[PDB]
């Protein structure tokens, strides 16, 4: 029986049992590199969250509730594609792109640290979360590397990198590669999404060695058609719930369900946070690489008779119960 009923218990075998053992520990710090979330929401009341704005950015003009209202109205109407961007352009041309970021940062941050009994109950609500907004080229590898270095200095155990910088290969700028290696050398996990390009292009940092790449799964566990895959996405990535994931949006207590690898990544950041929290609770040392390799090696591969291209599932669907066996002997 689940002591902390979570929306993803039925889609994620072993989640409920893991929540019965922990909701996170404050000694585990997650730094989220994304936009600027809304801490006034009740899902963050009592959450140990704080913002650190990179000092080398000039802060952007605040965004009016009205602009957020406009964005959400166009979403609620279910407009999509060209029609959606013509709508956004007509009412909020100068803030549409920042709102996309900030909105997603709300959703992602709540998926991770949302407090129980609020509108959004996240995976790891008792962990310490530092948002590092990039609201103020901003996805350039230089700037992500700089952000990463700071996240380490801030004491990150996990760095959730919400960003996808395009690439047609596994090569990224060396500065970013060095930043990822630096995370491995310091026992810090980096999670990031594989992207929603349907393999028309790939993403940095997902495809760089060292990162935990995350792909998006449907409700039934099969991979979403748009979720990028192949190369290092497959070798070092894992599939997790990505469709219809519940989360927050700014300025309103009403939550919204979103779809994408950006919504699957946070779930894995959360699951990883709990596995690390459990190490602390049991006096074992915190070990990011053990957690990452445990998740990868126990991931369940898709059935070739159900999914046409199994490599789309990357190493496989997240398998908490296997992870628990490897790390804790359960």
């Amino acid at each position: 029986v689940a002591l902390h009923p979570h929306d993803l218990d039925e889609r994620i075998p072993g989640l409920a049992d893991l929540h019965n053992q922990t909701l996170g520990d404050p000694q585990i710090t997650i730094v989220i590199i994304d936009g600027d979330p809304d801490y006034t929401l009740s899902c963050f009341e009592g959450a140990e969250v704080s913002k650190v704005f990179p000092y080398w950015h000039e802060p952007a003009e605040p965004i009016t509730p009205e602009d957020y209202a406009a964005f959400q109205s166009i979403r609620d109407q279910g407009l999509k594609g060209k029609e959606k961007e013509e709508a956004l352009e007509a009412v909020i041309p100068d803030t549409k792109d920042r709102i996309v970021l900030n909105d997603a940062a709300c959703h992602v941050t709540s998926t991770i640290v949302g407090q129980e009994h609020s509108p959004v109950f996240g995976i790891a609500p008792n962990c310490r979360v530092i948002n590092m907004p990039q609201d103020a080229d901003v996805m350039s590898p230089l700037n992500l590397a700089r952000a990463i270095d700071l996240a380490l200095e801030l004491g990150a155990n996990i760095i959730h990198c919400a960003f996808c910088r395009p690439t047609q290969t596994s090569e990224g700028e060396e500065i970013l590669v060095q930043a990822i290696k630096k995370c491995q050398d310091n026992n810090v996990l980096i999670v990031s999404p594989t992207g929603n390009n349907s393999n028309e292009s790939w993403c940095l940092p997902a495809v760089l060695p060292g990162t935990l790449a995350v792909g998006a799964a449907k409700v039934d566990g099969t991979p979403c058609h748009f979720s990028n895959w192949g190369g290092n996405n497959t070798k070092e990535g894992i599939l997790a719930p990505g469709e219809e994931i519940l989360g927050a949006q700014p300025c309103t207590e009403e939550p919204v369900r979103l779809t994408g690898t950006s919504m699957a990544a946070p779930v894995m950041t959360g699951i990883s946070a709990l596995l690390m929290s459990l190490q602390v609770q049991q006096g074992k040392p915190v070990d990011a690489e053990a957690v990452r390799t445990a998740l990868l090696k126990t991931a369940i591969p898709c059935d070739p008779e159900v999914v046409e291209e199994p490599e789309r599932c990357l190493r496989g669907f997240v398998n908490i119960p296997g992870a628990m066996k490897v790390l804790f002997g359960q």
Binding site: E85, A104, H107, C164, N196, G260, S262
Partner: peptide, 9 residues
């Protein structure tokens, strides 16, 4: 328009 972070469709 790239369908990231949230996919429409």
């Amino acid at each position: 328009p790239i369908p990231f972070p949230a996919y429409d469709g």
